[PDB]
Amino acid sequence: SMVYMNIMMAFTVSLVGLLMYRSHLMSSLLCLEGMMLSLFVMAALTILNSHFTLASMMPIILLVFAACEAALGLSLLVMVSNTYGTDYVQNLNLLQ
Amino acid sequence: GRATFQFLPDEARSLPPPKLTDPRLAFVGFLGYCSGLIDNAIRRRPVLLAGLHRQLLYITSFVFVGYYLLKRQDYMYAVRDHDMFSYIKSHPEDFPEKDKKTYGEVFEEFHPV
């Protein structure tokens, strides 16, 4: 019913100017690691309100990578700001 | 077709098979026979005929493989046809028998210069 239009307007959290930008990359990477819960919850209802009884594990597997992988891509964000000290998306150097 | 993820099924028994001395199988590995001669020439062999143990084992490979592959190709064009006639045969309503008319009949255009 209504709970399917919220949360959906929430899953436009993408909003992409705020997905790569502006600086403090950690804000961009943040709205990514919370782009989940729009994928999770939304898929923790349709599975639940009707009894699938089987795909019920799927919600668990939507995290176990969403944490595993998104925690990888954090790593690079040390390598960027190790050599700098400010992330600041404004580093372009490799060009085209 | 059926018996999926099979290189070829059992039904290919009824095909000739494509035995040797066809120009392709000869040609297959010819393009390898001009491949072997390369294989030397890249490294400054500089033989242009070097050890026959590299200058062979190619020709052995291609024509075997070229052969073992042509066995199914010819198959496929058979199962293509076979599934056509057997459909063309039924539904004769979709397949008319045209009449026979010589020229006491047809006019063309008729536009000479």
Binding site: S50, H51, F52, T53 | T4, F5
Partner: protein
């Protein structure tokens, strides 16, 4: 290209979680379960390209078992047969 190995040899990779009615370990059903074994029965020997213009009946209600999309509208339209006339008579019900 879809090889479908699990058809040739014996293993089951997935094929179990796939649809709304398969097992459900203790044998407990879904809500719209009974319409699956109805709708799959329709298109099987079909090649699915005529399915869309053939069955379509056993499918639609199945889409309307799932979301309850219509019955909720004919319902919301009792709130207009009553509850505009509340003052105009037939309170409806008598309590109890």
């Amino acid at each position: 290209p879809f090889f479908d190995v699990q058809k040739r040899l014996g293993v089951d990779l997935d094929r179990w979680m796939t649809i709304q009615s398969a097992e459900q370990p203790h044998k407990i059903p879904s809500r719209c379960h009974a319409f699956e074994k109805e709708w799959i029965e329709c298109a099987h020997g079909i090649g699915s390209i005529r399915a869309e213009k053939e069955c379509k009946i056993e499918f639609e209600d199945f889409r309307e078992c799932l979301l309850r999309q219509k019955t909720m509208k004919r319902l919301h339209a009792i709130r207009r047969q009553r509850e505009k006339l509340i003052k105009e008579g037939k309170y409806t019900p008598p309590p109890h």
